């Protein structure tokens, strides 16, 4: 075995084709399935795995009540091969109410965060054993990507934040080698708030697109250098913006350096990636709620801040059906690196008061150079019938 280096070119994407679906909430009405939120996907050299943050309970269970809170002592990181639902035989890999994972070509790294809100701990677990730990530096909810990390030549990188959601916050990038922390860099450039990054290898470096809870409805960008640990940052130029809430496409605007100050506060985790001067991205179909999901290409949208020319639209979930977090992952092929994405399908409280629980399904899509048609792939559970 050898470390990953991602040094192949990016594949010629024409759009996205279906790859996987879990059916978790429909199976839960007659079966023992875990309650979860904040899922993600990541792959070793042979196959892909699905991850999620459990709530320490199955769904048809007295402990499923009030499962809406994000931080408790009972949350753990669940891990399965992609397409096996989270049944009672699932492995718990670490204690965590926030996490990230990646495979360096020889073994898994997991980054796991737990403890008191104002004095939290992060554990680094590599090849099945604890190797390092660090403590909250700003004493106000230490947090990380809820999605895969990226590793080149044995060095992994992860983005971590501490401090306020509606003001200035402290963000650092940690460089890690076989679980040992080797270097740390503070965030630099013009990005002013940085949460829940989605990251992809872009050899020789790494590139991340993130959430701005403070002032942007345009998304921040962070570029990371693996050879000298340097950092730079900016915003996605496209006039069609990716955050939720946002202004309608008739009236939205963006800036390559600054938060647009349009419906800026709050947000949702998402993704975008460069394709020359064009950008591919996904977003909720509705502008003020997490309903539907669509993807498209914007012409010159990576470099021209006034562009609104979209093409190759696809609906993934139609406007009547709930969505949630979404994120990128990368897969190495015979001659190029492909890009794929996943969407969280949230059900139950607080919006759907027919039940006492909150949980999710998922659906997954991968980039194709061939051709494709149309459809919609929602969650598909009937909350009027199944256990309260």
């Amino acid at each position: 075995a050898e470390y990953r280096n991602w040094s192949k070119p990016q594949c010629d994407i024409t759009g996205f084709a279906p790859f996987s679906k879990d059916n978790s909430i429909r199976l839960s009405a007659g079966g023992d399935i875990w309650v979860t939120r904040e899922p993600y996907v990541s792959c070793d050299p042979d196959k892909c795995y699905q991850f999620a943050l459990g709530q320490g309970t199955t769904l048809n269970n007295v402990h499923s009540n009030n499962t809406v809170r994000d931080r408790t002592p009972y949350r753990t990181l669940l891990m399965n091969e992609l397409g096996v639902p989270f049944h009672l035989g699932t492995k718990q890999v670490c204690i965590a109410w926030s996490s990230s994972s990646c495979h360096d070509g020889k073994a898994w790294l997991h980054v796991c965060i737990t403890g008191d809100d104002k004095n939290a701990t992060a554990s680094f677990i590599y090849n099945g054993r604890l190797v390092d730990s660090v403590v909250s530096w700003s004493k106000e909810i230490l947090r990380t990507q809820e999605s895969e990390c990226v590793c080149i030549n044995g060095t992994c990188t992860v983005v971590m934040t501490d401090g306020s959601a509606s003001g200035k916050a402290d963000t650092k990038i940690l460089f890690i080698e076989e679980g040992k922390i080797v270097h740390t860099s503070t965030l630099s450039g013009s990005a002013q708030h940085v949460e829940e990054c989605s990251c992809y290898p872009r050899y020789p470096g790494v590139r991340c697109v993130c959430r701005d809870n403070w002032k942007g409805s345009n998304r921040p960008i962070v570029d990371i250098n693996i050879k000298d640990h340097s950092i730079v940052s900016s915003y996605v130029c496209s006039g069609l913006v990716g955050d939720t809430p946002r202004k309608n496409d008739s009236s939205s605007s963006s800036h390559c350096l600054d938060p647009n100050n349009e419906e800026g506060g709050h947000g949702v985790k998402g993704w975008a990636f460069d394709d020359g001067n064009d950008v591919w991205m996904g977003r909720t179909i509705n502008e003020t709620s997490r309903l539907g999901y669509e993807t498209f290409k914007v012409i010159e949208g990576w470099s021209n801040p006034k562009s609104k020319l979209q093409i190759n639209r696809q609906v993934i979930v139609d406007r009547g059906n709930r969505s949630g977090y979404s994120g990128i992952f990368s897969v190495e092929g015979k001659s190029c690196i492909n890009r794929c994405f996943y969407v969280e399908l949230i059900r139950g409280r607080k919006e759907e008061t027919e039940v006492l629980w909150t949980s999710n399904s998922i659906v997954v899509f991968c980039g194709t150079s061939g051709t494709y048609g149309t459809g919609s792939w929602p969650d598909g559970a009937d909350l009027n019938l199944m256990p309260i």
């Epitope: 994000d70 004493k139 106000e140 909810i141 306020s164 959601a165 509606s166 003020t288």
Partner: antibody
Amino acid sequence: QVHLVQSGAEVKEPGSSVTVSCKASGGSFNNQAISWVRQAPGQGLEWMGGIFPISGTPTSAQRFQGRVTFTADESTTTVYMDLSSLRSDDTAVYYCARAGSDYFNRDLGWENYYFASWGQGTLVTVSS
Amino acid sequence: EIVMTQSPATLSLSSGERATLSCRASRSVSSNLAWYQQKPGQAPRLLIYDASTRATGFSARFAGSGSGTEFTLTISSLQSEDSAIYYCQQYNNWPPWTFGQGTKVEIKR
């Protein structure tokens, strides 16, 4: 009873800072947020910020974000609010109040952030 | 960010009659709406919350109404102590927690 009790009135020179404080009569700082709201003469109500007394996450309104800080102590059972770089315009009654809200969710934000109970109000004026 | 518009600005009516006050939000606040009464020279007091339910200090003569982007308060059989200023406030999920500019009631004796 639970009720909030505030510190006395003040005159401060421009460019100075002021400390105001708020204490629970019942000793009963549960995690429901303590919030600061001000009222300038003949003018509407204005939220400035707040803190959860146990879990300790502070928050501040955008207009005040560089100028104000909040801190808390269970032992004195008191929340302290410091307002810096004072100007004549800061002349107002400052109230502490107790919110219906007692948890912050990373993703979903706050819930029940309305003011159930209020202190006496403290008059602060800025003058030479 | 979310703007609260309250009307009328001033209202005046005789005792023993009904009075009505209104509030509007620049985006839908989905029932996350409260009303306060402030009597002259005192701290404000919570009157209604979730647009729909009244606090312990107030009786069946006070009623809340409306949803989404428009809201209403009604006082039945007006009395001497009702002479006060009233404010709406929203609390929809994220800061800041904006108040309306308020409505004054004075009694036409």
